[PDB]
Amino acid sequence: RFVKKDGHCNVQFINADIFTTCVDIRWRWMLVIFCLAFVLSWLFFGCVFWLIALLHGDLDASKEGKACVSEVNSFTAAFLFSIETQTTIGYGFRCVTDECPIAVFMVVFQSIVGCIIDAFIIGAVMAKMAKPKKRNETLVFSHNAVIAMRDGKLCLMWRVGNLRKSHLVEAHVRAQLLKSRITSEGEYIPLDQIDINVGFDSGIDRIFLVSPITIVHEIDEDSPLYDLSKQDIDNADFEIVVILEGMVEATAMTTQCHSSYLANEILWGHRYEPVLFEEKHYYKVDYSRFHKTYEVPNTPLCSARDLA
Amino acid sequence: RFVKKDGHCNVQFINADIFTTCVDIRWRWMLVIFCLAFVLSWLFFGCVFWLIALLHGDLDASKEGKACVSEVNSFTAAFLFSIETQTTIGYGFRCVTDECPIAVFMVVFQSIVGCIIDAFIIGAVMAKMAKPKKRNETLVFSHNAVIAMRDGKLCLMWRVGNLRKSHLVEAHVRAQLLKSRITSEGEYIPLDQIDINVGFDSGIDRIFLVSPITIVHEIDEDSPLYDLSKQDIDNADFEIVVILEGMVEATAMTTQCHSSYLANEILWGHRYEPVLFEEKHYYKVDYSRFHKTYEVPNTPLCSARDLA
Amino acid sequence: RFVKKDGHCNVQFINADIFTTCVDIRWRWMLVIFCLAFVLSWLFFGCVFWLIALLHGDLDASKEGKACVSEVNSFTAAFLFSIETQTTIGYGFRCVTDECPIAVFMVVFQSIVGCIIDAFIIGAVMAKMAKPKKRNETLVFSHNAVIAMRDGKLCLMWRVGNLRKSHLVEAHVRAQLLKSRITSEGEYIPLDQIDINVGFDSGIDRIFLVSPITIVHEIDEDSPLYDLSKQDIDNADFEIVVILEGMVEATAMTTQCHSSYLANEILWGHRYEPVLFEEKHYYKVDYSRFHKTYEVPNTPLCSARDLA
Amino acid sequence: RFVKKDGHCNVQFINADIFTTCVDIRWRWMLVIFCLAFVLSWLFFGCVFWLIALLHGDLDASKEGKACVSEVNSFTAAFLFSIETQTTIGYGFRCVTDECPIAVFMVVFQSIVGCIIDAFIIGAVMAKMAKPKKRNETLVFSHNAVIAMRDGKLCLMWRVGNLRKSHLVEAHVRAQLLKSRITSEGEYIPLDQIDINVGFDSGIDRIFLVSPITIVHEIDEDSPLYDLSKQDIDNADFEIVVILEGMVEATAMTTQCHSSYLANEILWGHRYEPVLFEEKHYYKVDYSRFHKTYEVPNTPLCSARDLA
């Protein structure tokens, strides 16, 4: 019972390219990889510079006079020379001097490595408006849930506390139930496949409406609430995880929050209203108590729905 | 009766991460936050530079000779040193000198802070073609509205003054009406939920047509215009806010302009035509008077529609 | 009869913010506006620098000694000073010297103008994969069109020469016909509104199929081909512009190429097949002759379709 | 029988703008074009600089004294001068000197070419999250396929090994079959056009469900399996290429992998189960053997399905 590590189907007896999605950012993290790539490139350039300054035409410390390039003080000085050149700072006193064939070749390759390294930086991630870490999920869904008589014939709706700038709302159910069934000669397909959205059936979801607050209508003979309901199904339950689908301009990215809301926590309602008016007009400012809605401390342990 | 502060459902007795959507631009605004972040970073670097120049190996004003770094004149000079270095200007006379261990460490971290700060700039917002502040809403909808006999059986259409480059037009109704109804044992669901698009029913909206100018057909028994219409419903009205949905490649961003057009301002039509031809061909240049269309100073206070 | 300048509805007696869509590129154009904005900003900075160098604390040519800033040679030298500083080049010999209060203020504002101008550059347009100038419209539609008997009951299809990487194909008809009709008391609505896709009705378009090559089925009583067809409707025609809709992940951007294909150029078919095999397998390389398909030099001037 | 070079329709007797899609990257390729454009621009600037230094006001090697610009050592030195200036490095000792009219003009045009060339770099491709080279196609479809009795009335499903982060799954069939049929007076339309998804008909595909594993229901009279099946259709087959459509937020980009799975490789099933449990719960880690599922070494060469 998880989300990342489910879909269990395969064993026998058990029971450079980095890129991919792993190139991202974690707020105060994941820039360390970029900075270390930077410093390794810089040190590579610096060590090449020191070795060649040991073996350059003007040699170390300009033994020939009129140096082909201002030789570095030491190996660390060559590191600093590399960083100076590539970072587009360019003092000149310690940098290249009058052109020299080998010096010309190296400096043009250094210009090349500089421009493509700047390209490496421009390959910075854009974890931005398109790919944020704080999801627009300001919709408080519910808490310990409710059943009630549902107007006798499965009529109610779910709480929604959407504040996504009061706009950008359009959803559907999609979803899928789960239970290990049986099938002839197959692997029994441990899946309901029925996808019945029975319950608070009030018809806003499949209807082309801005904010689907209700769920599509699923008539009886799919739910065990023919006769006797509430506690008989509240006690007997495994997973009634409720997941909505298809809000953000597409059904794919959407949001797949678990929200188990199992029948154990759908006990008898018990959320009358803490509002002092219950119908007119309240805040003009903000929400206060989130979910409390739809009590039913009236239907006892036994509650017939359709058979009566 | 608002748009930003509606959906009133919850009280009990009342009655660093910035990011989010608040990282945006307001034309001649919201760049001040970026510039102040810049200057605070720059001053932090400068004050660190001044303190370390007070405590560097070459100390203040190069008391050791052959300075590890050209020491700044003062604290403000250290501020300018920081800005000089990070902004990739790099004079050199006041900047770093022959490499020094602590100087090497600080300057490499300064290169790091420079490259990631450039990343901070590249994290500039792109409030552009994708996210503009001037919405493509050149469609003049209407003004004080009209009723007429609607060809007896709810047949008319609404004015549209679309000039969105004469293209990029495809819409639908969606929408939803509102009124505080009652329901058994529930919160009465103060919502119509019917979503009847009754009125100028002429059938272009739901039909797969480029520019839906009309509205879908809603036959009688949903509108109080069985017998007696026009003024009886014009006087008795609360909110007939007309909102279209789903134009810009999706039903979600769309446009949700109010356009109340309540039955009080649907008085008797009174827009014959100011055109001199009324049927042939007019401008080749631009619109002039927007909305004036569809008079009806003929149907009196009493106007039967279907019952007759 | 146009595309940019149609929708003629309004006259009476006639008969800084730039942004918008006008911020774009035209291949070898529209970068001139960016470069001129650049140079005007640069000249503004340079002229301010020259005037202040005339009125600075160290005055022109450092009349005070130990100049607050290396004064420019002249007004053009101040222009070059500005360009040097902002473009993040930073020599130093001609640039700022030991810090000075007014010099400190000006140089920090210059750092500000530099960073926000770099922001102006980063506000470069991205006329790229998302917004290209070369549309993926490699589909050769047709030429002088064909009618034939259409299997008696409007059965044929249109040519398609799609080579959009052999993928990314999913379309529909949508569309709309046009003719000046009449209507009671209205403006007669000079529009067909019928949107009948009569003709090569073979049923792939509305069916959820990858590449809709045919058109949806429109039975007779909508086309004048009850009895007598081909030339009687070929001669009498105004505009039969054929436009497909909804290919590129949405019905809105799509493609609205005219492709008039009027009944005058639907004369008798006359495209048998220039293929040497006509059924098996041809190129493995590329297309050759585009459109030639579906002759019918057999149906004479008179051609009954349904009445017979 | 291909994908890139199909759609054979046209011969007669056969039988600067680069941009387009060809501006992309191939991992360790396609940056060479960018670097060569860079170096050609740099060499153009350098050769112009050398020629003008030969013909400048201060002439070669500053024959006038107080040079308008520090003249380069040679033609290669002019190349390096160009690269130095444009790459925003800016030493100064070899670079421009006190302003000179012609020198002013050239250096301002050089600033222009520098800023627009930086624009050329910023026109770097973004072959990234939106346009990756490694497709999210971790779904193992199947191998040598199976038929079985299909519960008598075409009831089974296809294997899916999706691991696309266990989410982002929503598909449909679309597709199209192919066979050279005949038609009256037309080109015979070598295409089935039926698009019958007959086979493992179990109804999840067209149903609005998260992961469509099955295919839509196509009853008999469309498949030759009235009486006698399995081997009679397994031996007689040309192309039964199975392609799914519409997963990645749209039906257009989707995935069009061939997966021929022709009836020759649908021989008798022969994949019982290598699982040791076959129904409960296996890995919590990863897949092992991919496809092996749905044996049927029981139906002989002759196998009636519906007629019996």
Short mmCIF file of C-alpha atoms in Angstrom, two decimals, chain B:
data_model
loop_
_atom_site.label_atom_id
_atom_site.label_comp_id
_atom_site.label_asym_id
_atom_site.label_seq_id
_atom_site.Cartn_x
_atom_site.Cartn_y
_atom_site.Cartn_z
CA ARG B 1 -21.55 39.31 -4.81
CA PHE B 2 -17.91 39.35 -5.93
CA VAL B 3 -15.34 37.22 -7.76
CA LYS B 4 -12.18 37.17 -5.60
CA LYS B 5 -13.90 36.81 -2.22
CA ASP B 6 -16.81 34.42 -2.83
CA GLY B 7 -17.46 30.79 -1.92
CA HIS B 8 -18.42 31.51 1.68
CA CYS B 9 -18.57 28.25 3.62
CA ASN B 10 -16.59 28.21 6.89
CA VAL B 11 -16.40 29.88 10.30
CA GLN B 12 -16.47 28.72 13.90
CA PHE B 13 -16.97 31.94 15.90
CA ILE B 14 -15.10 34.48 13.73
CA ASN B 15 -17.88 35.33 11.24
CA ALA B 16 12.62 31.49 3.16
CA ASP B 17 10.08 30.68 0.43
CA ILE B 18 8.57 33.57 -1.52
CA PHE B 19 8.35 32.25 -5.10
CA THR B 20 4.74 31.19 -5.82
CA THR B 21 2.74 33.49 -8.10
CA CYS B 22 4.02 36.56 -6.24
CA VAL B 23 7.21 36.41 -8.33
CA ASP B 24 5.88 38.41 -11.28
CA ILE B 25 6.01 41.91 -12.82
CA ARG B 26 3.61 44.87 -12.81
CA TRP B 27 4.99 46.87 -15.77
CA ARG B 28 6.64 49.74 -13.89
CA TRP B 29 6.81 47.68 -10.70
CA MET B 30 8.09 44.43 -9.14
CA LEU B 31 11.64 44.89 -10.43
CA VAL B 32 12.37 46.75 -7.19
CA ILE B 33 12.38 43.45 -5.29
CA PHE B 34 14.95 42.06 -7.73
CA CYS B 35 17.14 45.15 -7.50
CA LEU B 36 16.99 45.18 -3.70
CA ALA B 37 17.93 41.50 -3.54
CA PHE B 38 20.82 42.41 -5.83
CA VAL B 39 22.02 45.30 -3.68
CA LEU B 40 21.71 43.32 -0.44
CA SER B 41 23.82 40.51 -1.91
CA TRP B 42 26.33 43.08 -3.17
CA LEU B 43 26.57 44.78 0.22
CA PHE B 44 26.99 41.42 1.95
CA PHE B 45 29.91 40.60 -0.33
CA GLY B 46 31.37 44.07 0.21
CA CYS B 47 31.18 43.94 4.00
CA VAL B 48 32.74 40.47 4.05
CA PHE B 49 35.49 41.86 1.81
CA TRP B 50 36.12 44.83 4.11
CA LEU B 51 36.24 42.70 7.26
CA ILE B 52 38.62 40.20 5.68
CA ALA B 53 40.77 43.04 4.30
CA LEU B 54 41.00 44.16 7.91
CA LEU B 55 42.03 40.59 8.81
CA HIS B 56 43.70 39.33 5.61
CA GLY B 57 47.23 37.97 5.38
CA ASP B 58 48.40 41.14 3.65
CA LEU B 59 46.20 43.07 6.13
CA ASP B 60 44.80 46.56 5.49
CA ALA B 61 46.67 48.67 2.91
CA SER B 62 49.22 45.87 2.29
CA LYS B 63 51.26 46.07 5.47
CA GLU B 64 53.24 43.00 4.35
CA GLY B 65 54.28 44.15 0.87
CA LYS B 66 53.42 42.25 -2.33
CA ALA B 67 49.79 42.19 -1.30
CA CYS B 68 47.75 39.01 -1.57
CA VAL B 69 45.01 41.35 -2.88
CA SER B 70 44.72 45.07 -3.58
CA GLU B 71 43.15 46.25 -0.33
CA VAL B 72 40.18 48.60 -0.57
CA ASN B 73 40.31 52.21 0.54
CA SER B 74 37.46 51.79 3.04
CA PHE B 75 34.18 50.00 3.72
CA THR B 76 32.47 51.75 0.81
CA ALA B 77 35.51 50.90 -1.32
CA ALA B 78 34.93 47.27 -0.35
CA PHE B 79 31.30 47.59 -1.44
CA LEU B 80 32.51 48.88 -4.80
CA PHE B 81 35.09 46.09 -4.94
CA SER B 82 32.33 43.52 -4.51
CA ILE B 83 30.11 45.13 -7.15
CA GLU B 84 33.05 45.43 -9.55
CA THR B 85 34.00 41.77 -9.18
CA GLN B 86 30.54 40.20 -9.36
CA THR B 87 29.18 42.41 -12.16
CA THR B 88 31.97 41.01 -14.37
CA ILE B 89 33.70 44.35 -14.98
CA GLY B 90 37.16 43.61 -13.61
CA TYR B 91 39.56 46.55 -13.62
CA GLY B 92 42.41 44.83 -11.79
CA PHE B 93 44.22 47.84 -10.34
CA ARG B 94 41.98 47.73 -7.27
CA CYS B 95 41.20 44.02 -7.66
CA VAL B 96 42.95 40.81 -6.65
CA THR B 97 46.73 40.50 -6.97
CA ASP B 98 49.19 37.57 -7.03
CA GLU B 99 47.49 34.49 -5.64
CA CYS B 100 47.36 33.92 -1.88
CA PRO B 101 45.89 30.83 -0.12
CA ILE B 102 43.11 32.62 1.76
CA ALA B 103 42.79 35.01 -1.18
CA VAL B 104 42.50 32.01 -3.52
CA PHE B 105 39.75 30.50 -1.38
CA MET B 106 37.76 33.72 -1.15
CA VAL B 107 38.08 34.53 -4.85
CA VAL B 108 36.94 31.07 -5.92
CA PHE B 109 33.91 31.35 -3.66
CA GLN B 110 33.33 34.79 -5.20
CA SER B 111 33.38 33.24 -8.66
CA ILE B 112 30.82 30.75 -7.36
CA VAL B 113 28.57 33.46 -5.95
CA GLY B 114 28.91 35.35 -9.23
CA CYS B 115 27.85 32.44 -11.42
CA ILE B 116 24.90 31.49 -9.22
CA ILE B 117 23.85 35.13 -8.94
CA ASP B 118 23.88 35.31 -12.73
CA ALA B 119 21.65 32.26 -12.46
CA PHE B 120 19.41 34.30 -10.19
CA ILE B 121 19.11 36.93 -12.91
CA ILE B 122 18.47 34.30 -15.57
CA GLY B 123 15.65 33.28 -13.27
CA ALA B 124 14.04 36.44 -14.61
CA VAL B 125 10.30 36.20 -15.13
CA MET B 126 8.99 35.69 -18.67
CA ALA B 127 5.71 37.60 -18.47
CA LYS B 128 5.45 37.40 -22.25
CA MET B 129 3.37 35.95 -25.11
CA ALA B 130 2.46 33.06 -22.80
CA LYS B 131 1.60 35.22 -19.76
CA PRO B 132 0.54 38.72 -20.86
CA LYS B 133 -1.10 41.43 -18.77
CA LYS B 134 -3.22 42.69 -21.70
CA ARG B 135 -5.74 39.92 -22.35
CA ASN B 136 -6.91 39.23 -25.91
CA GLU B 137 -10.44 40.28 -24.97
CA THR B 138 -11.22 42.66 -27.85
CA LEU B 139 -14.72 41.14 -28.03
CA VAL B 140 -17.31 43.74 -27.07
CA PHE B 141 -20.06 41.56 -25.63
CA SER B 142 -23.09 43.82 -25.17
CA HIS B 143 -24.69 46.55 -23.03
CA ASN B 144 -28.26 47.11 -21.78
CA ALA B 145 -29.67 43.93 -23.24
CA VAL B 146 -32.73 42.89 -25.27
CA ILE B 147 -35.48 40.28 -25.09
CA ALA B 148 -37.93 40.58 -28.01
CA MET B 149 -40.32 37.75 -28.90
CA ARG B 150 -37.28 35.60 -29.81
CA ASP B 151 -39.25 34.28 -32.80
CA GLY B 152 -41.80 33.01 -30.27
CA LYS B 153 -39.71 29.98 -29.27
CA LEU B 154 -36.48 31.43 -27.84
CA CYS B 155 -34.63 32.25 -31.06
CA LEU B 156 -32.03 35.04 -31.06
CA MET B 157 -28.31 35.53 -30.41
CA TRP B 158 -25.89 37.79 -28.53
CA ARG B 159 -23.71 40.53 -29.97
CA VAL B 160 -20.00 39.78 -30.38
CA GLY B 161 -17.38 42.35 -31.37
CA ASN B 162 -14.39 40.03 -31.58
CA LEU B 163 -11.27 41.46 -33.22
CA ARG B 164 -8.72 38.97 -31.83
CA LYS B 165 -6.76 39.21 -35.10
CA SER B 166 -10.00 37.92 -36.70
CA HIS B 167 -8.94 34.40 -35.65
CA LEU B 168 -8.27 32.28 -32.55
CA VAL B 169 -12.00 32.01 -31.79
CA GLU B 170 -13.70 28.87 -30.44
CA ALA B 171 -15.88 28.99 -27.32
CA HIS B 172 -18.66 27.33 -25.34
CA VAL B 173 -21.11 28.19 -22.58
CA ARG B 174 -20.27 25.92 -19.63
CA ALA B 175 -21.23 28.40 -16.89
CA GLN B 176 -23.61 27.89 -13.94
CA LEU B 177 -26.61 29.70 -12.47
CA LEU B 178 -26.99 30.48 -8.76
CA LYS B 179 -29.89 30.59 -6.30
CA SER B 180 -30.40 29.39 -2.72
CA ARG B 181 -32.58 26.30 -3.07
CA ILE B 182 -33.49 23.70 -0.42
CA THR B 183 -32.62 20.02 -0.03
CA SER B 184 -33.55 17.23 2.39
CA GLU B 185 -31.28 17.13 5.45
CA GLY B 186 -28.42 18.77 3.56
CA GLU B 187 -27.10 22.32 3.59
CA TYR B 188 -29.80 23.04 0.97
CA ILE B 189 -27.01 23.50 -1.62
CA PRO B 190 -27.44 27.24 -2.34
CA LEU B 191 -26.88 26.61 -6.05
CA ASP B 192 -29.17 26.08 -9.03
CA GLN B 193 -27.06 23.24 -10.50
CA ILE B 194 -29.44 23.28 -13.47
CA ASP B 195 -27.06 25.27 -15.71
CA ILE B 196 -29.88 26.01 -18.16
CA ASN B 197 -28.68 28.26 -21.00
CA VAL B 198 -32.19 29.47 -21.81
CA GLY B 199 -32.72 32.61 -23.85
CA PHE B 200 -31.26 33.46 -27.27
CA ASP B 201 -31.32 29.78 -28.20
CA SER B 202 -30.13 29.48 -31.80
CA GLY B 203 -27.61 26.62 -31.77
CA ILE B 204 -24.04 27.57 -32.66
CA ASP B 205 -22.45 27.11 -29.24
CA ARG B 206 -22.52 23.33 -28.77
CA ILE B 207 -22.25 22.81 -32.54
CA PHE B 208 -18.62 22.41 -33.60
CA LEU B 209 -18.41 25.82 -35.26
CA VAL B 210 -15.59 28.37 -35.35
CA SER B 211 -17.26 31.33 -33.63
CA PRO B 212 -20.17 30.42 -31.33
CA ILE B 213 -22.26 33.60 -31.36
CA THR B 214 -25.55 32.09 -30.19
CA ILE B 215 -26.32 29.96 -27.13
CA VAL B 216 -27.37 26.33 -26.89
CA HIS B 217 -31.09 25.54 -27.06
CA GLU B 218 -33.01 25.29 -23.78
CA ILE B 219 -36.72 24.68 -24.38
CA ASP B 220 -39.43 26.10 -22.10
CA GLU B 221 -40.49 24.70 -18.67
CA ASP B 222 -37.08 25.92 -17.45
CA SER B 223 -37.78 29.67 -17.87
CA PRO B 224 -40.78 31.51 -16.38
CA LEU B 225 -41.75 32.67 -19.89
CA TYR B 226 -44.57 30.12 -20.35
CA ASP B 227 -47.04 33.00 -20.41
CA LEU B 228 -46.18 36.66 -19.79
CA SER B 229 -42.56 37.72 -20.37
CA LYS B 230 -40.37 40.80 -20.90
CA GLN B 231 -41.14 43.08 -17.96
CA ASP B 232 -42.46 40.52 -15.46
CA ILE B 233 -39.03 38.86 -15.46
CA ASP B 234 -37.16 42.13 -16.12
CA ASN B 235 -38.37 43.62 -12.83
CA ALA B 236 -37.91 40.41 -10.80
CA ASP B 237 -34.22 39.55 -11.07
CA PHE B 238 -31.19 39.12 -8.82
CA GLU B 239 -28.14 38.11 -10.91
CA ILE B 240 -28.07 36.99 -14.55
CA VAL B 241 -24.29 37.38 -14.89
CA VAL B 242 -23.38 35.95 -18.30
CA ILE B 243 -19.98 34.25 -18.56
CA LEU B 244 -18.61 32.37 -21.57
CA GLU B 245 -15.98 29.67 -21.22
CA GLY B 246 -13.23 27.92 -23.15
CA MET B 247 -11.67 30.06 -25.88
CA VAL B 248 -7.87 30.08 -25.58
CA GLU B 249 -6.95 26.51 -26.56
CA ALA B 250 -8.58 25.33 -23.32
CA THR B 251 -11.64 25.69 -21.11
CA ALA B 252 -9.61 26.57 -18.00
CA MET B 253 -7.75 29.86 -18.54
CA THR B 254 -10.57 31.10 -20.86
CA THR B 255 -12.16 34.38 -19.73
CA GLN B 256 -14.50 34.89 -16.78
CA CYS B 257 -15.58 38.52 -17.18
CA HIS B 258 -18.74 39.20 -15.19
CA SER B 259 -21.00 40.97 -17.70
CA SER B 260 -23.97 40.99 -15.32
CA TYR B 261 -26.55 42.08 -17.93
CA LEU B 262 -29.29 41.65 -15.35
CA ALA B 263 -32.92 41.63 -16.44
CA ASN B 264 -33.26 45.19 -15.16
CA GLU B 265 -30.94 46.29 -17.99
CA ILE B 266 -32.69 44.07 -20.55
CA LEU B 267 -35.46 46.65 -20.87
CA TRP B 268 -37.40 46.53 -24.14
CA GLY B 269 -34.45 46.40 -26.53
CA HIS B 270 -34.28 49.96 -27.92
CA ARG B 271 -31.34 49.42 -30.30
CA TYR B 272 -32.81 49.49 -33.81
CA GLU B 273 -29.75 50.11 -35.98
CA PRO B 274 -27.64 53.26 -36.43
CA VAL B 275 -26.31 51.74 -39.67
CA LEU B 276 -27.33 53.49 -42.89
CA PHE B 277 -27.58 50.20 -44.84
CA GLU B 278 -28.34 47.57 -42.15
CA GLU B 279 -27.44 44.61 -44.38
CA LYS B 280 -24.67 45.02 -46.99
CA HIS B 281 -21.10 46.04 -46.13
CA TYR B 282 -19.76 48.85 -43.97
CA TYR B 283 -16.22 49.66 -42.85
CA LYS B 284 -13.08 47.85 -44.11
CA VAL B 285 -11.43 49.88 -41.31
CA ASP B 286 -12.75 49.39 -37.75
CA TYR B 287 -15.76 49.31 -35.42
CA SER B 288 -17.55 52.51 -34.40
CA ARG B 289 -20.46 52.12 -31.94
CA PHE B 290 -19.89 48.67 -30.36
CA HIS B 291 -23.15 47.15 -29.18
CA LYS B 292 -26.31 48.83 -30.51
CA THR B 293 -28.39 45.97 -31.95
CA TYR B 294 -31.79 44.23 -31.65
CA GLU B 295 -34.42 46.78 -30.62
CA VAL B 296 -37.91 45.71 -29.57
CA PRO B 297 -40.05 48.73 -28.59
CA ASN B 298 -43.10 46.74 -29.70
CA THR B 299 -43.71 44.07 -27.07
CA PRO B 300 -45.53 45.77 -24.16
CA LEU B 301 -45.26 45.09 -20.43
CA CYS B 302 -47.24 41.89 -21.08
CA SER B 303 -45.71 39.48 -23.59
CA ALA B 304 -46.71 35.83 -23.89
CA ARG B 305 -44.05 33.55 -25.37
CA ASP B 306 -45.27 29.92 -25.45
CA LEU B 307 -48.66 29.62 -23.73
CA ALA B 308 -50.09 32.56 -25.73
#
